[PDB]
PDB file of C-alpha atoms and ligand atoms in Angstrom:
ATOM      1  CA  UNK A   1      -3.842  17.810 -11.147  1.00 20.73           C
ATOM      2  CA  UNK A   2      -1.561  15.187 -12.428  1.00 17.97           C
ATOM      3  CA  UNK A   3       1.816  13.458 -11.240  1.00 20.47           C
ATOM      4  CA  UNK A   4       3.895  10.525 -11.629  1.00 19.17           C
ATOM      5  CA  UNK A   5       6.293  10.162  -9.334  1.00 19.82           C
ATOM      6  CA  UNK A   6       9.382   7.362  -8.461  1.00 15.71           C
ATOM      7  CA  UNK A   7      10.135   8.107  -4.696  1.00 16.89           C
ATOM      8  CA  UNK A   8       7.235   9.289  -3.162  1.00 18.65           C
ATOM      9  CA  UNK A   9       8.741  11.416  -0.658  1.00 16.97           C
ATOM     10  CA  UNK A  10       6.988  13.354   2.184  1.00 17.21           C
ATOM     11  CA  UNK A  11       7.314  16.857   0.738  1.00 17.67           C
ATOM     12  CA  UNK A  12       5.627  14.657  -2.574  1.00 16.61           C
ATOM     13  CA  UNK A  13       2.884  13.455  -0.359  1.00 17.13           C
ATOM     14  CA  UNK A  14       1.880  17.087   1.460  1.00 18.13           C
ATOM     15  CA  UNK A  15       1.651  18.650  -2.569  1.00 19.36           C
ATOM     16  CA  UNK A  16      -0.966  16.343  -2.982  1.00 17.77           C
ATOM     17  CA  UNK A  17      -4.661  16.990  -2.316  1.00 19.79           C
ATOM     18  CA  UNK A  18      -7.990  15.243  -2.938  1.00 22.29           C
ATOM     19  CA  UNK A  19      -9.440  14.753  -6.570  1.00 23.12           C
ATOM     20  CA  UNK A  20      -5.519  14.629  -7.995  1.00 24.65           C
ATOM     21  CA  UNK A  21      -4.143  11.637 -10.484  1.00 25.44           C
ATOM     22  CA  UNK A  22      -1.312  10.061  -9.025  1.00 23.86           C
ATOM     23  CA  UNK A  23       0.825   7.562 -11.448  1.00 23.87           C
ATOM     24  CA  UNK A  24       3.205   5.399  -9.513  1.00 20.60           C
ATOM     25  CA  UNK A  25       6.724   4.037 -10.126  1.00 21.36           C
ATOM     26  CA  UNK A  26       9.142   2.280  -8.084  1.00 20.23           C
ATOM     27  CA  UNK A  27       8.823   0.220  -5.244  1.00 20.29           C
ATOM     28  CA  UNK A  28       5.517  -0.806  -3.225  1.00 21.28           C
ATOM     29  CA  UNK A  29       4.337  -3.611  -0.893  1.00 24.18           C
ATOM     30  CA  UNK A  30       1.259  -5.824  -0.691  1.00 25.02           C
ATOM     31  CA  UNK A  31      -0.518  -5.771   3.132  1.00 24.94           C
ATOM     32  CA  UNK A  32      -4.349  -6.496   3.697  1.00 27.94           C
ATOM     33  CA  UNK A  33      -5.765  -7.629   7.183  1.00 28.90           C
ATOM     34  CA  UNK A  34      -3.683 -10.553   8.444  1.00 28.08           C
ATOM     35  CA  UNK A  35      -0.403  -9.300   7.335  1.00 29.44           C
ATOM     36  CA  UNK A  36      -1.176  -5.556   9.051  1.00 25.93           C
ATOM     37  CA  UNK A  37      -1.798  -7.701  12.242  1.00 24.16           C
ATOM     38  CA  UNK A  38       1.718  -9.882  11.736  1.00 25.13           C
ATOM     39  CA  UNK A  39       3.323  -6.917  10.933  1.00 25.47           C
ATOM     40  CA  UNK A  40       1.815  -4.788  14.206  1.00 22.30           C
ATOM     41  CA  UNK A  41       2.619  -8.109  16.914  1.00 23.40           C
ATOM     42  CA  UNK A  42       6.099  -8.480  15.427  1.00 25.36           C
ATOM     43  CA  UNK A  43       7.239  -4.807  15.975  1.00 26.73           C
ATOM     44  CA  UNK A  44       4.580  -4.246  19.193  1.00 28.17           C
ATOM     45  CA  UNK A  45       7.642  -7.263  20.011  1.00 27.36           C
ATOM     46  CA  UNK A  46      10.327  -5.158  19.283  1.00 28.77           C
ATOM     47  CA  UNK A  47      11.370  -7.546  16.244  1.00 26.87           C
ATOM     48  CA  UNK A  48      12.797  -6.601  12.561  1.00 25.28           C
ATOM     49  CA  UNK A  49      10.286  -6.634   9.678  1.00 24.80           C
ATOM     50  CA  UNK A  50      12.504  -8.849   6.593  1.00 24.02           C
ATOM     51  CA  UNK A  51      11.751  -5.472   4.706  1.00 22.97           C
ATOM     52  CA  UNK A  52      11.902  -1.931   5.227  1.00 22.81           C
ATOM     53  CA  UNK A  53       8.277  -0.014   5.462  1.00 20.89           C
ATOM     54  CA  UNK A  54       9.727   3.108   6.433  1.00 20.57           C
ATOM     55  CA  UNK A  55       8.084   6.123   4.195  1.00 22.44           C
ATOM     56  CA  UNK A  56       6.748   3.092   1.640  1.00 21.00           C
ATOM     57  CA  UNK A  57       4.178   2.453  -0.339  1.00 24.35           C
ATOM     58  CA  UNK A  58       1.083  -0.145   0.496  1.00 24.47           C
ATOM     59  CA  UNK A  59      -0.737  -2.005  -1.344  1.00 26.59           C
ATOM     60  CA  UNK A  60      -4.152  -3.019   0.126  1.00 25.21           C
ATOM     61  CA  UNK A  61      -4.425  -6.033  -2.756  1.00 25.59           C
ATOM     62  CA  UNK A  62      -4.470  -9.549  -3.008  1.00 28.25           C
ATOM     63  CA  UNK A  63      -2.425 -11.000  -6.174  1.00 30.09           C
ATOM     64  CA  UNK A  64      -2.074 -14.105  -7.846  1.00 33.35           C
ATOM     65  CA  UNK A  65       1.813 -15.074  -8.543  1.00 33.03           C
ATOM     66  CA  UNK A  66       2.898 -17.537 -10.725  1.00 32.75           C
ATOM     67  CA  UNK A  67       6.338 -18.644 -11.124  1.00 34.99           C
ATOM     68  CA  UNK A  68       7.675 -18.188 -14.773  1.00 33.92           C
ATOM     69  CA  UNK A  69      11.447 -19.590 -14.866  1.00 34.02           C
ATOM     70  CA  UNK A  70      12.634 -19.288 -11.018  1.00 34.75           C
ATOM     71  CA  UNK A  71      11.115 -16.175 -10.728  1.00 36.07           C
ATOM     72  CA  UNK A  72       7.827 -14.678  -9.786  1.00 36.39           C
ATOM     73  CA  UNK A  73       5.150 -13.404 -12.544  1.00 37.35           C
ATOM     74  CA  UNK A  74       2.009 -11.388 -11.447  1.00 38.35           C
ATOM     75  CA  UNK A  75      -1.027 -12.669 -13.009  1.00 36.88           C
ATOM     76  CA  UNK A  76      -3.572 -10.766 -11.423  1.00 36.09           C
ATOM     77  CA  UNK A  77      -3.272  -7.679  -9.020  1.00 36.20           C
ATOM     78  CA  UNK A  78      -6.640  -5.803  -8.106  1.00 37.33           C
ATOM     79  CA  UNK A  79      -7.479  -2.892  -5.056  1.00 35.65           C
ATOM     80  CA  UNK A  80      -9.301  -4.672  -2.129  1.00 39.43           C
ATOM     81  CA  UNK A  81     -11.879  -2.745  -0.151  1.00 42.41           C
ATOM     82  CA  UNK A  82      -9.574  -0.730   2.376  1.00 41.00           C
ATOM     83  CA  UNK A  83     -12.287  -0.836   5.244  1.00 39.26           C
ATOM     84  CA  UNK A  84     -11.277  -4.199   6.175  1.00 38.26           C
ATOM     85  CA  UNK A  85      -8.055  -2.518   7.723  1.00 40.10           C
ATOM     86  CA  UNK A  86     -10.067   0.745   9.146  1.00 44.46           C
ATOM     87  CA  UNK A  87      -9.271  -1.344  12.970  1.00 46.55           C
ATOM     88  CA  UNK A  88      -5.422  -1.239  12.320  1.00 49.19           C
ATOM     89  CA  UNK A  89      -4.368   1.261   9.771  1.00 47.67           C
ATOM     90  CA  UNK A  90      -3.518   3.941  12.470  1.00 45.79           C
ATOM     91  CA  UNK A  91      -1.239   1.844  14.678  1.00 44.27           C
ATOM     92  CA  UNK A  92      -0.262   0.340  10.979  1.00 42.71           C
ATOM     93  CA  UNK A  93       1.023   3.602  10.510  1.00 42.24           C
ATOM     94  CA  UNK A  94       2.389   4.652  13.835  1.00 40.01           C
ATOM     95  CA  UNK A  95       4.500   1.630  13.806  1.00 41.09           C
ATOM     96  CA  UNK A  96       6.013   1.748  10.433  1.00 41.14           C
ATOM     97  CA  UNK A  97       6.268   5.512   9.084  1.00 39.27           C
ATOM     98  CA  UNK A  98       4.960   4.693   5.683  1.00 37.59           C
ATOM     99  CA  UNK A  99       4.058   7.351   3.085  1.00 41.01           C
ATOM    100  CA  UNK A 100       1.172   5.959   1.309  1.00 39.81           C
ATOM    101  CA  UNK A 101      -1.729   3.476   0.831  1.00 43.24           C
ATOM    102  CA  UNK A 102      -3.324   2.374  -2.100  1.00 43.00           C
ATOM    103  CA  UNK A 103      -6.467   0.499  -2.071  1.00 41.21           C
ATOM    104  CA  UNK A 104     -10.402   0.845  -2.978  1.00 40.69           C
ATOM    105  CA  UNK A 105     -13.627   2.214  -1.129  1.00 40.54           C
ATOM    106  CA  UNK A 106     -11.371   4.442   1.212  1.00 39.79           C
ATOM    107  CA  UNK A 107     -11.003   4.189   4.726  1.00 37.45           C
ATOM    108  CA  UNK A 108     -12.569   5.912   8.084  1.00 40.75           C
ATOM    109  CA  UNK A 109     -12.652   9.646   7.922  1.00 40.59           C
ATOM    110  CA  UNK A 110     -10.971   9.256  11.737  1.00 43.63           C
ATOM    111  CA  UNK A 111      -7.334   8.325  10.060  1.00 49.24           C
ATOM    112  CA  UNK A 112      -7.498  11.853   8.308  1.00 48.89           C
ATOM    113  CA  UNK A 113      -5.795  12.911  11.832  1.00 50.34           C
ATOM    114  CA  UNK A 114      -3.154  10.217  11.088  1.00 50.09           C
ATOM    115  CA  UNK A 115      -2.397  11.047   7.469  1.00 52.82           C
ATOM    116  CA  UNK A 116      -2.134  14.866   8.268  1.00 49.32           C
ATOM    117  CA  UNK A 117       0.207  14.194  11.542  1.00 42.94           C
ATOM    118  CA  UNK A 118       2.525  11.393  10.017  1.00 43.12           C
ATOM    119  CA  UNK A 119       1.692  12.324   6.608  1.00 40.71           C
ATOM    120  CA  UNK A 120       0.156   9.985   4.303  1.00 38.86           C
ATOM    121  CA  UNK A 121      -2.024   9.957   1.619  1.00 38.62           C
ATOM    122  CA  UNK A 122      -4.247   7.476   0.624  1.00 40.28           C
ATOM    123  CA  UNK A 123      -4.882   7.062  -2.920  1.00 37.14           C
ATOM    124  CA  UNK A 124      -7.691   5.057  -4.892  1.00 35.87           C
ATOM    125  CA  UNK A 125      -6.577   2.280  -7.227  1.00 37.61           C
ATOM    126  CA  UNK A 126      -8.997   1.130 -10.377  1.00 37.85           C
ATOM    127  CA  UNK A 127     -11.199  -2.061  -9.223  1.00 36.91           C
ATOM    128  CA  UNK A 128     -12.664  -4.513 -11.373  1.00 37.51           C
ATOM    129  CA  UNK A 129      -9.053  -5.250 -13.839  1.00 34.96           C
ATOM    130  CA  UNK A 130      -7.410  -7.002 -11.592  1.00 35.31           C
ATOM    131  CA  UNK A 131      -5.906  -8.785 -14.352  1.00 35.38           C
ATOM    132  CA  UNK A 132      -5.182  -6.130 -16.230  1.00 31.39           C
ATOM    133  CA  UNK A 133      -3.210  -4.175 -13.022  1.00 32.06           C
ATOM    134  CA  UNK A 134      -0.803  -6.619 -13.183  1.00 31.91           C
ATOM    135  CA  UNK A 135       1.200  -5.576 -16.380  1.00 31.94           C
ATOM    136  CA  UNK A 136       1.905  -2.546 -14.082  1.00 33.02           C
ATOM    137  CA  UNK A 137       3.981  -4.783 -12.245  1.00 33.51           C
ATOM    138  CA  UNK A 138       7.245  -4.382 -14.196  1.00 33.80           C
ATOM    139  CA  UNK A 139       9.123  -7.037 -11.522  1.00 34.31           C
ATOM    140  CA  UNK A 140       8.581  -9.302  -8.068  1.00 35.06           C
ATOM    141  CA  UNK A 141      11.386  -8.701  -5.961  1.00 32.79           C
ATOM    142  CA  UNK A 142       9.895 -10.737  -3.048  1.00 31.93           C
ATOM    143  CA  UNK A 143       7.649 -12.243  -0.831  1.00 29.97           C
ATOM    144  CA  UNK A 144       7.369 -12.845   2.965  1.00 29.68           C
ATOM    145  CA  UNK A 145       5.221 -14.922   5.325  1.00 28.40           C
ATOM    146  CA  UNK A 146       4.206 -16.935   2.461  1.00 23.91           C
ATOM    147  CA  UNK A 147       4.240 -19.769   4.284  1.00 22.47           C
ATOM    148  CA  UNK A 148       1.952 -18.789   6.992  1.00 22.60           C
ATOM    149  CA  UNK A 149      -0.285 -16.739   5.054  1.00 24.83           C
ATOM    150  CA  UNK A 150      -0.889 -18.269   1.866  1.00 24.74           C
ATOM    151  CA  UNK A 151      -0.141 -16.129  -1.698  1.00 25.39           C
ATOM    152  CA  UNK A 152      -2.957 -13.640  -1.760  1.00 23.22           C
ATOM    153  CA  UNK A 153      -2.657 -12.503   2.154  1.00 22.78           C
ATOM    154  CA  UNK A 154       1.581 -12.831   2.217  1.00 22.01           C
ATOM    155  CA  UNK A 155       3.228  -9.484   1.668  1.00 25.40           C
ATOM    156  CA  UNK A 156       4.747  -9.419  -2.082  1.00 22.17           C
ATOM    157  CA  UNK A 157       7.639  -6.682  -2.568  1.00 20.55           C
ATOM    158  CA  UNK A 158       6.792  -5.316  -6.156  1.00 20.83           C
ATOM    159  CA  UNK A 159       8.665  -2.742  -8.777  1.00 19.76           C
ATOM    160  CA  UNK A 160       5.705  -1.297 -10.912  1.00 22.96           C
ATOM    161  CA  UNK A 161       5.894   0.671 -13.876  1.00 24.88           C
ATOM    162  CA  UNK A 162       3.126   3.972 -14.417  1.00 26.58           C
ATOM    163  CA  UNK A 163       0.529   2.458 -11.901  1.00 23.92           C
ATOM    164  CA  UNK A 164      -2.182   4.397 -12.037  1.00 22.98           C
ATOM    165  CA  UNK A 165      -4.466   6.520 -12.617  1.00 20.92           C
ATOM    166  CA  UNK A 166      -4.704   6.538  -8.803  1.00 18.08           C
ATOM    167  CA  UNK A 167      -6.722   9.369  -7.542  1.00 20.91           C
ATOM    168  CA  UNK A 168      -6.213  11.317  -4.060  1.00 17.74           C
ATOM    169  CA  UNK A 169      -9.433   9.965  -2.153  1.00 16.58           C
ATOM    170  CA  UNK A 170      -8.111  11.098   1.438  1.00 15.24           C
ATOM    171  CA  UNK A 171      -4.767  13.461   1.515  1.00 14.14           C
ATOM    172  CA  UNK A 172      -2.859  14.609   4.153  1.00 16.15           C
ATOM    173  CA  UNK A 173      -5.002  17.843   4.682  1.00 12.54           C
ATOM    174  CA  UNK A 174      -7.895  16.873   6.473  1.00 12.49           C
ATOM    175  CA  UNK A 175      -9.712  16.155   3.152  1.00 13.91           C
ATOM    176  CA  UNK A 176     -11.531  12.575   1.819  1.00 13.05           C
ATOM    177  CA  UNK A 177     -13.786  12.768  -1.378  1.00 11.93           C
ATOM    178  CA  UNK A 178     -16.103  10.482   0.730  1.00 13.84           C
ATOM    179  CA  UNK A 179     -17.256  12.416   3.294  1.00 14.29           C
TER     180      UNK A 179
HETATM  181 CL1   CL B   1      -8.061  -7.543   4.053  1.00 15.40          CL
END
């Protein structure tokens, strides 16, 4: 079954079940490994995040930015394998509220608890075009701990325009087209 949504809200994410085609617009963030751990230590500390997480939209990816003008074009934009995160997504998710992920390979079928109790959904991107992912990305809004983590692992604040197809691999329902 196909969508395409703009604010993925949580009523949104519990329609949704395994093997559907998701197209995204609107607002989503970049976070692999090191900025999931940054992001867990700095609110475990009781700090504020430069950005707002709550019921957003991840992006397990690791683009290339290149400044065009004084502003930030995306070059390249491809799903990184979400395992990598499998150690963190659950407190990830505890600590933030967010509605989604999007990344490749899936993730442990143990966050399925997670997804149905806080309700996310996490949704398979198209590997192997990374280049080509990144006309989906209609604007940069911004980026954060560039500095200390370099482009790739910093978290990049992104408007994108029909990304997709992104299919359902785990939903909110106990359900993950890998297991
Ligand atoms: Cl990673």
């Amino acid at each position: 079954m196909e969508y395409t949504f703009n604010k993925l809200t949580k009523k949104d994410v519990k329609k949704l079940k395994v093997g559907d085609i998701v197209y995204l617009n609107g607002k989503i963030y970049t976070a692999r490994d090191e900025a999931h751990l940054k992001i867990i230590e700095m609110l475990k500390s009781n700090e504020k995040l430069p950005f707002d997480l709550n019921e957003s939209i991840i992006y397990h990816a690791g683009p290339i930015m290149k400044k065009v003008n004084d502003s930030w074009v995306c070059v390249s934009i491809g799903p990184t394998t979400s395992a990598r995160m499998n150690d963190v997504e659950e407190e990830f998710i505890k600590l933030t509220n967010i509605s989604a992920i999007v990344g490749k390979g899936g993730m442990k079928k143990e966050l399925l608890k997670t997804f149905e109790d806080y309700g996310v959904v996490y949704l398979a991107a198209p590997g192997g075009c990374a280049a080509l992912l990144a006309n989906s990305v209609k604007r940069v809004d911004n980026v954060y701990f560039l500095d200390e983590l370099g482009m790739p692992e910093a978290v990049w604040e992104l408007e994108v325009n029909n990304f997709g197809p992104l299919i359902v691999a785990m939903d909110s329902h106990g359900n993950s087209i890998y297991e």
